[PDB]
Amino acid sequence: SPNSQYLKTRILDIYTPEQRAGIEKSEDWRQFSRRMDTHFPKLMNELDSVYGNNEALLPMLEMLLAQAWQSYSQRNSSLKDIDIARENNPDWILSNKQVGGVCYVDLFAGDLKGLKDKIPYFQELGLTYLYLMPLFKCPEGKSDGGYAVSSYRDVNPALGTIGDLREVIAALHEAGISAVVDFIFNHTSNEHEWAQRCAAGDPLFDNFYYIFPDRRMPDQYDRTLREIFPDQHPGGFSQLEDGRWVWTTFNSFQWDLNYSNPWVFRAMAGEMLFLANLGVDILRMDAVAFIWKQMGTSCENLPQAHALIRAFNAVMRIAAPAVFFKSQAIVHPDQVVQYIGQDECQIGYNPLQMALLWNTLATREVNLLHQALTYRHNLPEHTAWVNYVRSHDDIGWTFADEDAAYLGISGYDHRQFLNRFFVNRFDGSFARGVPFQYNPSTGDCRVSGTAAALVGLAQDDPHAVDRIKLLYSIALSTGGLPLIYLGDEVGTLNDDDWSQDSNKSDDSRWAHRPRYNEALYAQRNDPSTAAGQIYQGLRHMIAVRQSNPRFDGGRLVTFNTNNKHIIGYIRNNALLAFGNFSEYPQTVTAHTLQAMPFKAHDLIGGKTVSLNQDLTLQPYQVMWLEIA
């Protein structure tokens, strides 16, 4: 395997003697060269563990490094300053000062220019991180809400131009907000040029996807493949009009890129560098679990998938240090955490905490949540969870069966309950969600619906507002970067038109992808409305989280409340948080609180509370006690 010093000499071969001498003593090369020596070894190792002795590896690598140099050379000076900062401050993602938001530009602000006008509100809310849903060219009509990419560089016409995007990012950076977008690197739409040329037989795009002549291998593969959208098609393949079959983990119009071909990695790295130079701070690595296939396995979370992501990480450490990765793996908890690492994905969605927040509201029992916060919360250094309550997706019950078993809970039986409960098919349920991808041959089902709809705000449940505040209080204080699904801060309900829109009716997720509700946002400052109650409640928690250093970092120690309905944990040994998931008042006995200070200030209610006496929490009440 070639070394850094060697590959660099060949990178400079494109220059004439006169030019070369000039490049070698330039500041940009000096930085690139230094980063090369520090991170190239990782890049080489990761690529070698995947491609091995593939004859194309070296040629691919050199081509990748050459364009990596050009990319960094072209990279804007301001971004290079952010690179140096991020380099010396890896834990910026762990700061309590960070609070993120996510929205669809079209649904939330109409278009990119319209989004730019929304920045003041984002600052008003306190955001320091803004994630924008798929913004690039995609098939007309059905594109899986933009996740079927037809181009990673041409902005969706309906949203604007690449120019508007560059303006938005700059404006966001001016407002003290990091820009976060998707890097749908596991698949492209079937209309993407690469897909068209590959299927057409263009030798330049040969083996860019997985295409088979018939069902022989697809059938073999399907023996162990999980079905993501069983409603769309069985197994993981879709048939082309010419009779052939292509690997389509998701919708039939989304073709899985073939990373077993090193040229595919190089290509995607090229697209990654493009996004990097737009000034993007964080790339949401979509479906990181599926980027590697192997007959006889689930084709999820395979070793090479982690290796490839770590290779991508190295490229950024070399050509754009400011760019971090956000894992979005919605899989078994043992698998979720493996993607999070300083050299892989620095942050990642915490689906386990999210799913259990909802689980707890339904059962009123914090057992699973407590268990999760006790054994699966803390992460290795320089990494952090992205805690959330809802997102653009359906809710999957990805808690661990093994974990549930230890508690005497049958995973399968429990999901049946959760699913029925949240789709309002369980007596007394306050939830008003809708089913998503019910799978007859497995019994698995997911849930769609906005946070407000799931807590009962649709029927005006008097507990709805407090439920929303309780859930978000957990995501905002457990440790990690909290991501708010914009629209939630004002109690936005499900969309009322999706089911009759022919391009959406077969995907219930659109039920929880409502547009900006002018009426609710106009009430965000009226304490007499649910919108104002929700907004002011969340904003207050946001203000406290960002100003109080006791919430800094991502580590926590759970506190046994001795009340099955109350969750408890401590941040930095100075902040004791209590959360009552019961619709009835619940108590934490004085006996349980004996080791705590006699008195402590509660940042939520702003009152001083005595801990040397029984502490009774009102229904769904949240307390953030400063015990130090």
Ligand SMILES: OC[C@H]1O[C@H](O[C@H]2[C@H](O)[C@@H](O)[C@@H](O[C@H]3[C@H](O)[C@@H](O)[C@@H](O[C@H]4[C@H](O)[C@@H](O)[C@@H](O)O[C@@H]4CO)O[C@@H]3CO)O[C@@H]2CO)[C@H](O)[C@@H](O)[C@@H]1O
């Ligand atoms: O305040 C509202 C209601 O609160 C109480 O009911 C709660 C239970 O206390 C919770 O434990 C939970 O019960 C679920 C349970 O979590 C779920 O697993 C499922 O239980 C199955 C089990 O999985 C299966 O293996 C087999 O044993 O059958 C069990 C029973 O179906 O379903 C339970 C609900 O039926 O949630 C409920 C509802 O919030 C209290 O008891 C109620 O009186 C009260 O209304």
Ligand SMILES: OC[C@H]1O[C@H](O[C@H]2[C@H](O)[C@@H](O)[C@@H](O[C@H]3[C@H](O)[C@@H](O)[C@@H](O)O[C@@H]3CO)O[C@@H]2CO)[C@H](O)[C@@H](O)[C@@H]1O
């Ligand atoms: O953060 C320090 C410490 O926190 C946790 O311990 C607390 C318990 O969770 C909490 O229940 C309480 O313990 C009491 C017992 O429940 C009760 O049976 C009796 O023994 O009185 C105890 C009070 O001394 O308080 C402790 C201390 O805060 C966590 O479990 C520890 O691992 C952690 O070191």
Ligand SMILES: OC[C@H]1O[C@@](CO)(O[C@H]2O[C@H](CO)[C@@H](O)[C@H](O)[C@H]2O)[C@@H](O)[C@@H]1O
């Ligand atoms: O229910 C959706 C399904 O897909 C996952 C895979 O991680 O979600 C991401 O990728 C999908 C396909 O590209 C997108 O449709 C989805 O919006 C995106 O979040 C999981 O959430 C789940 O298994």
